[PDB]
Amino acid sequence: PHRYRPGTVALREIRRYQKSTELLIRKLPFQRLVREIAQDFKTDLRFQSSAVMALQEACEAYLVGLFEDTNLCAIHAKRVTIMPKDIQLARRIRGERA
Amino acid sequence: PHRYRPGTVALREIRRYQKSTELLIRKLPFQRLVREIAQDFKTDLRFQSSAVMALQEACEAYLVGLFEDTNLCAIHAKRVTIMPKDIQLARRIRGERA
Amino acid sequence: KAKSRSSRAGLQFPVGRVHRLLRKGHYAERVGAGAPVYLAAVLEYLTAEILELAGNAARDNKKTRIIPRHLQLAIRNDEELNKLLGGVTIAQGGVLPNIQAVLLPKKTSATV
Amino acid sequence: KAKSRSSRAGLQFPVGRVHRLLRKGHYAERVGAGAPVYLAAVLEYLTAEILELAGNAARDNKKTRIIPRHLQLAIRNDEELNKLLGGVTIAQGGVLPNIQAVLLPKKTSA
Amino acid sequence: RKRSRKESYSIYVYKVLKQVHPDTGISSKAMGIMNSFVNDIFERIAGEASRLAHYNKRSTITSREIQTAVRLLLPGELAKHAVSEGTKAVTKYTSAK
Amino acid sequence: RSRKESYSIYVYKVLKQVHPDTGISSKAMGIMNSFVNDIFERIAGEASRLAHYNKRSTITSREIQTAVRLLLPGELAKHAVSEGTKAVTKYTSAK
Amino acid sequence: VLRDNIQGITKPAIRRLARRGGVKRISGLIYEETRGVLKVFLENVIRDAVTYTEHAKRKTVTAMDVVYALKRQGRTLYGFGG
Amino acid sequence: KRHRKVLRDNIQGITKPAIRRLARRGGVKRISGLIYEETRGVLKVFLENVIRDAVTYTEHAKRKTVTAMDVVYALKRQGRTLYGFGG
DNA sequence: ATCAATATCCACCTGCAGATACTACCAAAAGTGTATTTGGAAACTGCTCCATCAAAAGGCATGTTCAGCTGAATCAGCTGAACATGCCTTTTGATGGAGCAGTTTCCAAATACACTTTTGGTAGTATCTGCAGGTGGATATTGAT
DNA sequence: ATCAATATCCACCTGCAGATACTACCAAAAGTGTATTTGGAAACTGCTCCATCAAAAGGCATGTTCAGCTGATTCAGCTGAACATGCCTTTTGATGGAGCAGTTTCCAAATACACTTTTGGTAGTATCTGCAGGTGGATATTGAT
Ligand SMILES: [Cl-]
Ligand SMILES: [Cl-]
Ligand SMILES: [Mn+2]
Ligand SMILES: [Mn+2]
Ligand SMILES: [Mn+2]
Ligand SMILES: [Mn+2]
Ligand SMILES: [Mn+2]
Ligand SMILES: [Mn+2]
Ligand SMILES: [Mn+2]
Ligand SMILES: [Mn+2]
Ligand SMILES: [Mn+2]
Ligand SMILES: [Mn+2]
Ligand SMILES: [Mn+2]
Ligand SMILES: [Mn+2]
Q: Where Phosphothreonine occurs along the chain (chains A, B)?
């Protein structure tokens, strides 16, 4: 029986995904969450295919970026594990809140 | 011969300075640094005293602003003492060299 | 019977002015007669909201004259004005008194 | 008879269309004969610059067709293009392979 | 030779100040910040408006552009109130000719 | 069925001068178009401000230049400024 | 088996985004924290988009609506026009 | 003429005592020795980026005097909009 | 939990700097009210392309196991805070000079404008082919032993 | 070290999704010839920026001392990473109609014109008055013992 050690697949997933550009959230569940949030602003809305795809590209871009700055915040506190407090520090310093 | 313990006068100064709005950089040393840097861009320049003061206002505001973020980074690392690497983490996440 | 547009609209803020500045920046080929009324109102409205919160700060510091420090305490203490003016610096404004918790002394009993 | 302003200034970019867009962009009341030439040129140059580097990234990856992934690698690996576009996302760009040192495994006999 | 006329919003900010705080003055510095504030917000809106008109192939900025631009630029309760005070002053100005 | 103008003709011309045996996906072509519109607006806009700051009713090549100085980094700026000044000279020097 | 839409953004999806951002090791609390951030983003962006839609007198949110939104939210997106 | 006296090392006029006062306003309690040099550096970059733009406006206007408005237009461009000096 | 040093607070008191204020008043705005066009709301359709929906298909929710991470407790060295001492620089307030922004008048270039002549660029079409995976098998990396 | 279990690389193939290539027709560029507009060229202001310097407080530089913070160490227990499914959601593909967007119409509302009126910004003056900063003096706050 064979077993890769904690972090080894992780590093592998990093390399794999830093090499690709394909979106990483499944399309439908994103499309539902978009249509839901929008309903709170105007009812019976329709969404051009491209408009959702635009939103997803922006949205994933944003998060990937925030995970960089998060990971730099974790690392700063001599950790290798991102925690909420790290996402929090990044979004504070980015000017996004507090 | 009486002695305030390390960090009691510091806290006293935080209250003092956060309470005031006067500029904390001596005026003349700051005016020379402005003429020095400019001259190096273009010679024979003159500055409306208000142009020098506009710069000093922005600069102190920027620095005070940076120092808030820096302090956060220090604290994030479970320290109370700001270090270069805090200023750098702050300016990385701000996108001043991301 | 020259009757101010400002007065016609029920405003202090000068509609005539706001129509001329919209023309001179061009911003578009034509300016609707309602645009500079709506805008002069929104401007009046926002200056009012600030002056009320600033005056309050002035009164809170036992002053009769609003200075910059006052305006700053107003803009920064209001969640919605803060976000509007998030990327703006008020000369001679200072900062809000704010010391991180972890930095405060802890030489007393208190915690058992 | 009818010369192109493009061909006159010796540009691939359309000095006519740039002039029109400057008039009808509410940028000012009046637009000098030179501005839309100058601009057309500056857009051409910068287009040239990026395609160059991208072309090179498509060659680095054994490919003749430039894709977004090539434009991202071009821009984000050039110090001066990366600053200019620092506030821009490239759809289907991904990111530069980059793994913080401290996250790499111990390694060596020691 | 006669110094050129440099117009401000000072007259109007003062009228409004006395409306909200009849006994409260304002420093020439604070009145400075208050001028730059109006000038700033004026552009931000006029801008968004300028754009928005374009985005829909319209050559005319109307009170309908001004309003959308105000919903885009102002957060929550400032927007609601600013849109009221607008709509109101327009509805009045219309019926007040 | 109405004409949706782009810059994709002139991107493609400028591709073939620079990499005559290199192609471009539609998606890349879109990014390039966003790019040109983006920089167009950035320059036109800074030039608009400049004209207004100096009570000038006219955007000239001089505005486009200052603009390009302010918006472009160091080396990009120089090389755009040249490419511009050249194209203007070439256009003037053309009966 | 009804489940919230925000929970449609699954741990393995969030893990994948974190991986592209160079994250090795992920606290369990990240996934909710992340969904909350992702929600605020979309709110902030979609609100502005719809506001453009309603100005255009349309019931269909266009790519351009989103792009114009994303531009005034400082997140400018290349490849969807404009 | 007199030719102006030579300007050099003026960044050292941002004294250790002025940098602490600023950090205090930013609510800083303990300051490493290495901060003062780091801060001088950051300040110098900031000042350069602003003065460059400012002077770019001054030159565009064909003035030899940098105005308050040149600094304000520069600060606005850098996304550091300043109230209290005109515009 | 007492007490001593010293920082803090607060409430009056002057003499300004800066605010408010009386015009004077007048150049530039604002606005009044004709005479334009003319932008765009409105109504109608047609043809995209969007929501739905049911078959095809491949990720993810699930519990167990333990590797190794985080965070806790301890300690030592040394850094940075505080403070006393000596004194150099900046601040403050003039002055005289002049450099140079800021105004005002001619207009000769420079754009705008209205019309006409042509054509470059788009959008349908009509073909062509880069490469996205699929296979085979060789080799590298990892991890247990 | 060995040995293998699994991941990774590379060379080759090939159908087709998505390029490039081709065509015609028309919006919008360019040519022509008036019709406005502008932004230096010269010629003067007065302002305000520069420099200078003298006096003196006021803050800065420096050296000493040690409190307590940082960062190193060690460690136990906790918490995510790894790992395999079949079931459940997503994905894929095709149908009907919502609604975007193309188009013409026409009138309320916008621009342009050239008068008339009012205003707000000014320079000149006076004229008040909020509060800056200074003094006691009463009242916390801190830190040692
Ligand atoms: Cl209107
Ligand atoms: Cl020109
Ligand atoms: Mn009131
Ligand atoms: Mn029409
Ligand atoms: Mn040690
Ligand atoms: Mn001059
Ligand atoms: Mn042709
Ligand atoms: Mn392949
Ligand atoms: Mn092989
Ligand atoms: Mn000494
Ligand atoms: Mn253990
Ligand atoms: Mn229908
Ligand atoms: Mn008056
Ligand atoms: Mn006082």
A: 43, 70
